[PDB]
Write a protein that binds this ligand. Structure first.
Ligand SMILES: O=c1ccn([C@@H]2O[C@H](COP(=O)(O)OP(=O)(O)O[C@H]3O[C@H](CO)[C@@H](O)[C@H](O)[C@H]3F)[C@@H](O)[C@H]2O)c(=O)[nH]1
Ligand SMILES: O=c1ccn([C@@H]2O[C@H](COP(=O)(O)OP(=O)(O)O)[C@@H](O)[C@H]2O)c(=O)[nH]1
Ligand SMILES: O=c1ccn([C@@H]2O[C@H](COP(=O)(O)OP(=O)(O)O)[C@@H](O)[C@H]2O)c(=O)[nH]1
Ligand SMILES: O=P(O)(O)OC[C@H]1O[C@H](O)[C@H](O)[C@@H](O)[C@@H]1O
Lengths: 638, 206, 309
C-alpha cells in the first residue's frame, strides 16, 4: 500500500552542483517547476565536489527536527543510518531559482569499499572494471552509495511511492543494483548522449547519421578503449523501468547502440525570464554590446580601422570538442565569408569569438595592457572634457560681453589648450603598436600553442586580423565570467551583446547553446543533426525559420563542403541585413521563447514519472485510474 | 599619494591588513648601481627597521619602493590582474551607492508619510538589497589570493631573476611582504611614466 | 516621464504620500477656450473620478495637468523654491553616497582582516555617520510645509485669479490636492518649453512622458492636439464633435478603438451630464489597467499613427 499521487522524487546526477556542460543547465533550469510541483518531496543527489560546493550550495543542518516534516521524516532516519555506518555527506539548498534540497555524498568517505563493490559489480552484473580509470571508480562509488540510500528510504518509508530518476551513465550504476536487489522504487534513466556516438563522430571519418544501423557495438566499443564504460551505460538503460533520451535523434541512436528503444523523449527546457516590457531585451542587447565594444577597442589598440556601429559579433561557444561542436566548420566558413565580403566590397566588419576552454597560463600581458591603455585614455578624455566644459560655460554665460560676439565658441583653440593636447597625445602614443604587429588571434598564453586545434586551423585559413580582412578572429580559451579582467561579462550577458550565435555541431544530442540564444532573442545557426535543430525544424517550415532567427545547416543529406557553403550563405545573408531588419528578427526570435519554456517541456517529465509508477505498480495504477492503460511508452499512456 | 594608494591596494589585493592613513612611503631611485647608490644598505636598514618596529609594537606601516632599471619582460600578469580586479570592485561599489542614493532620497522626500516614523533609514536592509550584495561578494571573491600566497616583491618578470642583486638581497634579508612585517618591499625595475598601466605617475609626481 | 516625476516631487514637497511608480499623468492642452476645448468637462469629470477612486480603495494616483495660456506674472516663488529644495536634497544624498562608497569599498578590500568577520557591512552605522545624518535632516527640514498647507493647483501668479474660468472651476469642485484625493490638479498657464525653470520639457517631450491626453472638445474642426498625441503613442480621449474624433469613429468600431488608445466621447447625441459620465467611465477604465496593459496599448496606438501620416 504505497500512495501513487503523493510520491517522492529523487533526481541523481554528477553535475548536481558543478558545471561540466548541458546537464548542469538541465537540472538548474528545471528546478522551479519541479519544486513548484513537489515542494518538500523532491531531492537532487550527486557526488560532493569538496573544492567548489562552497560557492553554489547553502549548507543546512539536517539533524534538527524542524528541517523535515513528519510525512518526510523517513528521509531523515535514512540519512541517520548512513551516518552510523560512517558515510559522510552534505544536505543543503542549491543557490538557484527554485531552491531545491540537495544530498551530496563524499565519495572519499566510502573509498575503502571500492574493491568488494567493483567485484560485486563484476560477479552479479558482468562489468569488468579495470582500476586505471578514476572516472568509472567514482561512478561505481556513487552508484553503490545511492542504491544503499534508496534501499534505506524504501524500507523506512511506507506511505509514499518513490521515483528514482538518474541522468547519464556516470550516475547510472545504481540502476542495475535497484533491479537486482528488488528495491521498492521505480526508476527512470535519461541518457543525454551515447558513449559510442560521441566517439564515432569525434573521429570525423564516417557518415554516422546515415550508416548507424551497421555498426558492431562490441567491436567499436573495444577499439575506442571504452567497453567497461559502455557496459555501465547499457546496464543503466536496460535496468531502468523507464528509459529516456532528450531528442528523437539521440533516441534513434540509443536504440541501435544501447539495444533498447527509449520509452519517450525528454526535450530540454529553459527557465524563461519574462520581462514586464517585451522590448526590455532589446535594451539589454545594447548595454551588453557596449561592454563587448569596450573589450574590442582594447584588443585592436593601434589597429582600429573599422566602425563598431557597422560591426557584427558572431560567436561559437561550448566545451573543446573540435569536430563535434563544429569549430572546424565555423573557422572554415568565416574564412570563405571573409573572401566573399572582400570580393563584394562590403563595408561591414564581423568580429568572431570562439569561447572554448583550453589548457592555459592565464591572459597575455598584451591583452591586459591594452585594456589598461584604453581605460587611461578614457580618463584623460574625461579630464579634458571637464575643462572644455568650464570654457563653453564661461563663454555662454558671458555672451555677449567682453568682445564675445558669437553665442558659442567657433575656434577649437578657445576650448582645447596645449596642456590638454599634450596628455591626449601621450595616451595615443601608449596605444601605438610596433611596425607590422597585428591584433592577436588569442587572448591567453596557451600550454602547447603549436599543437592546439583551433589555433592551427585559424593559421591554416590565414585569418590573422589583417586590416584588409572583413572578418576578425578572437579565441578566448576559457569560459566567460563577470570577474574576467578583459571582458567582464557573464556568459548570458555576452550572448545578449552578440548578434549571431554559430553552433554547427556534428554531434549534439540537444544543444542548449543555440536554445539559450533563442530565449535571449539572439538568432543562431544550428544543424539538422542536433537535438534542438531537429526539434525546431519539426515546428517551423525551414525557410520561415530563418525569419525567426533559426538558421539550420544540413549536415545529414549534404557533402561536408556543401554544408560549409550553406553556413557561409547564411552568414553572408545575415551580414547584408540592415539594423531595422536585425531589430525585427530579434523580436521574432524572442517570441519563440514560449516553445522552450519548462512550463511546456516539463510535462514530458510528468509523463515519464507516470509511466514509471504505471509499470512498477500496475494493479494500484489501474484501480486509481479506472482502466488498464497502455504502458508501451510515454505517449501511449497519456 | 592617492594614486600611490590606488596601486598599493591592487598590489596587496587579498592581503590588505593595514590602514593607508597610517602608512608611509619611502623610496630609492636612479640608475641600477647596487653598491654605489646604496641599494644594499637601503634593503639592509629596512630589514632592521622592520625588526625594530615589530619589537616596539608600532602600528605604522612602511611601504618601500625601489625604482631602478633592470632587464625585464614587462609587468607580471598578477600586477595587471590585481589592478583590474580593484578597478572592477570600485565600479561595482559605484552602482550600489547609486541605488543606495535612490532609496535614501525616497525616504527623505516621503517622510513622515506612509508610515515612515524616522527622518532617515535606520536599517541597512532598507538601502542594501540582495542583488547588490551578490555582485559585491563576487568582486570580493575575485580579489582573494591562494592559501599562503604573499604580495610579491617585484612588479615585472625579470630576465635573470635568480642572479639579480636587489632581489637576492631582499630574499636574503627575508622581506617577503608577510602580514606581520611592518615594512613592505616593492622593486619596480623600470623608470616611472604616466603611461605605466599599474602606477600611472611620472617620476616627479610619484 | 522621469522629468515629470522630478517636477511632481518638487511640487508636492512636504506632501509626498503616494507612489510615482503607480501614478498616472493625464493632461489637456491648447488655447484657453474653457468651453470649446472641454476644460469644464475635464475638471468636472476629474472630480467625479476622484470620488470613484476613493470609494473603490484604489492605491493609484492621477495627476492631471492643464496646459493653457492665461495672462500671468510668471512662476510663483513657491514653485521655484520647491524645485531648488528638492535639488539641494539630491546633491546632499550624492555627497553622502560617495562617503558610503569609500566605506563599503574599504570593508570589501580589507576583508577578512583586522576583525572583519562578514564580507559586507551589516550595521548602517559603519556606513552612515552623524555628520551625514545632520546634513540629510537639514535638507528634509527645508522641504517641510507650514501646518495645513496643500500643494497649489497652479504654478504661476495670475493676472486675474478671481475671475479665471479654470481656477474657479477647480475651486468649485474642491480639487485642492489634499492627501486623500486620488486625483491632483496642476494648472500651468503657459505653453511648455525646455527653458521653463520648473518643468524643463518642450511640449512634444511632455506629451511622450504622459499616460493619457484628454481633449473633450465641443467645437474643433480638426484637433491637431489628439492627433499629435496619437503620433507619440499616447492614448487619448476625444469627442465625436471633434474632427479628429469624427474621422477615427468612421475608421474604427468604437469598442475596438479603445484598444488602440482612442476613446471617443459622445457630445452630439447625449445630454451634457451623460457625456461627463462617459468621460469618467473612460478615465476610470484606463486607471484600472496594469502596466503591461498600458505598455501594449501604447504599442497599438503607435501602430495607429501610420494612418495619420
Ligand atoms: O562561457 C560559457 C559558455 C557556455 N556555457 C554553457 O555551457 C552549456 C553547454 O551545453 P550544450 O547543451 O551546448 O552542449 P553540451 O552540454 O556541452 O553537449 C551535449 O551533450 C549534453 C550531455 O548532457 C546534452 O545535455 C547537450 O544538450 C548536448 F548537446 C550551455 O548551457 C552554456 O550556457 C557557459 O556556462 N559558459
Ligand atoms: O623613474 C625615474 C626615476 C628617476 N629619474 C631621473 O633620473 C635621474 C637619476 O639620476 P642617476 O641615478 O643617473 O644619478 P644621480 O643624479 O641620482 O646620482 C634623476 O635626475 C631623476 O630625475 C627618471 O627620469 N625617472
Ligand atoms: O505647451 C504647448 C501646448 C500646445 N502646443 C501646440 O498648440 C497646438 C494646439 O492648438 P490650439 O489649441 O492653439 O488650436 P487648434 O490648432 O487645436 O485648433 C498643438 O498643435 C500643440 O502642438 C504647444 O506648442 N505647446
Ligand atoms: O546591435 P544592433 O543589432 O545594431 O542593434 C542596435 C539597437 O539595439 C536595440 O534595439 C536598442 O534598443 C536600439 O536603440 C539599437 O538601435
Amino acid at each position: 500500500s504505497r500512495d501513487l499521487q503523493n510520491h517522492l522524487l529523487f533526481e541523481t546526477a554528477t553535475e548536481v552542483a558543478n558545471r561540466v556542460g548541458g546537464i548542469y543547465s538541465v537540472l538548474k533550469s528545471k528546478a522551479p517547476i519541479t519544486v513548484a510541483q513537489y515542494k518538500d518531496h523532491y531531492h537532487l543527489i550527486g557526488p560532493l565536489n569538496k573544492a567548489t560546493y562552497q560557492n553554489e550550495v547553502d549548507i543546512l543542518d539536517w539533524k534538527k527536527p524542524e528541517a523535515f516534516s513528519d510525512e518526510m521524516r523517513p528521509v531523515q532516519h535514512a540519512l541517520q543510518t548512513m551516518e552510523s555506518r560512517g558515510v559522510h555527506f552534505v544536505y543543503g539548498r542549491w543557490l538557484i531559482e527554485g531552491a531545491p534540497k540537495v544530498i551530496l555524498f563524499d565519495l572519499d568517505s566510502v573509498r575503502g569499499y571500492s574493491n568488494e563493490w567493483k567485484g560485486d559489480l563484476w560477479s552479479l552484473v558482468g562489468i569488468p572494471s579495470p582500476e586505471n580509470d578514476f572516472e568509472t571508480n567514482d561512478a561505481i562509488l556513487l552508484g553503490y552509495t545511492v542504491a544503499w540510500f534508496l534501499g534505506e528510504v524504501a524500507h523506512l518509508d511506507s506511505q509514499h511511492a518513490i521515483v528514482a530518476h538518474f541522468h547519464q551513465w556516470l550516475a547510472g550504476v545504481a540502476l542495475p543494483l535497484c533491479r537486482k536487489r528488488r528495491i521498492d522504487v521505480v526508476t527512470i534513466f535519461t541518457t543525454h548522449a551515447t558513449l559510442l556516438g560521441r566517439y564515432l563522430c569525434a573521429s570525423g571519418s564516417f557518415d554516422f547519421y546515415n550508416c548507424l544501423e551497421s555498426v558492431d557495438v562490441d567491436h567499436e566499443a573495444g577499439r575506442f578503449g571504452i567497453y567497461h564504460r559502455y557496459c555501465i551505460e547499457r546496464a543503466a538503460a536496460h535496468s531502468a523501468d523507464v528509459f529516456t533520451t532528450v531528442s528523437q535523434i539521440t533516441a534513434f541512436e540509443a536504440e541501435h547502440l544501447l539495444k533498447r528503444k527509449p520509452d519517450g523523449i525528454l526535450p530540454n527546457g529553459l527557465n524563461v525570464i519574462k520581462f514586464q516590457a517585451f522590448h526590455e531585451f532589446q535594451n539589454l542587447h545594447a548595454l551588453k554590446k557596449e561592454k563587448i565594444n569596450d573589450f574590442v577597442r582594447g584588443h585592436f589598440h593601434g589597429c582600429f580601422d573599422f566602425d563598431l556601429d557597422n560591426t557584427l559579433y558572431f560567436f561559437i561557444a561550448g566545451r573543446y570538442e573540435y569536430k563535434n561542436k563544429g569549430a572546424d566548420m565555423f573557422i572554415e566558413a568565416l574564412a570563405r565569408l571573409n573572401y566573399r565580403l572582400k570580393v563584394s566590397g562590403s563595408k561591414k566588419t564581423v568580429v568572431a569569438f570562439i569561447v572554448m576552454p583550453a589548457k592555459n597560463n592565464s591572459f597575455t600581458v598584451e591583452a591586459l595592457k591594452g585594456q589598461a591603455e584604453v581605460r587611461a585614455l578614457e580618463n584623460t578624455v574625461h579630464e579634458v572634457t571637464t575643462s572644455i566644459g568650464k570654457r563653453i560655460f564661461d563663454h555662454a554665460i558671458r555672451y555677449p560681453h567682453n568682445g564675445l560676439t558669437t553665442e558659442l565658441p567657433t575656434d577649437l583653440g578657445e576650448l582645447l589648450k596645449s596642456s590638454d593636447k599634450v596628455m591626449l597625445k601621450r595616451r595615443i602614443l601608449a596605444l601605438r603598436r610596433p611596425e607590422g604587429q597585428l591584433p592577436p588571434i588569442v587572448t591567453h598564453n596557451m600550454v602547447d600553442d603549436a599543437n592546439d586545434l583551433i589555433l592551427n586551423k585559424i593559421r591554416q585559413v590565414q585569418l590573422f586580423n589583417s586590416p584588409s580582412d572583413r572578418v576578425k578572429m578572437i579565441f578566448h580559451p576559457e569560459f566567460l565570467n563577470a570577474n574576467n579582467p578583459i571582458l567582464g561579462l557573464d556568459y548570458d550577458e555576452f550572448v545578449r551583446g552578440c548578434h549571431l550565435g554559430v553552433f554547427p555541431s556534428y554531434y549534439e544530442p540537444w544543444g542548449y547553446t543555440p536554445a539559450e540564444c533563442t530565449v535571449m532573442g539572439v538568432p543562431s545557426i544550428t544543424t539538422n543533426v542536433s537535438g534542438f535543430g531537429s526539434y525546431m525544424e519539426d515546428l517551423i517550415e525551414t525557410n520561415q525559420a530563418k525569419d525567426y532567427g533559426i538558421y539550420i545547416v544540413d549536415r545529414r543529406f549534404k557533402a561536408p563542403d556543401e554544408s560549409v557553403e550553406q553556413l557561409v550563405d547564411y552568414m553572408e545573408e545575415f551580414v547584408k541585413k540592415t539594423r531595422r531588419q536585425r531589430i525585427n528578427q530579434r523580436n521574432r526570435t524572442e517570441r519563440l521563447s514560449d516553445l522552450l519554456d519548462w512550463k511546456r517541456m516539463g510535462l514530458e517529465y510528468v509523463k515519464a514519472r507516470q509511466l514509471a509508477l504505471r509499470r512498477g505498480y500496475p494493479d494500484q495504477f489501474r484501480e486509481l485510474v479506472g482502466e488498464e492503460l497502455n504502458d508501451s511508452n510515454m505517449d501511449a499512456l497519456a
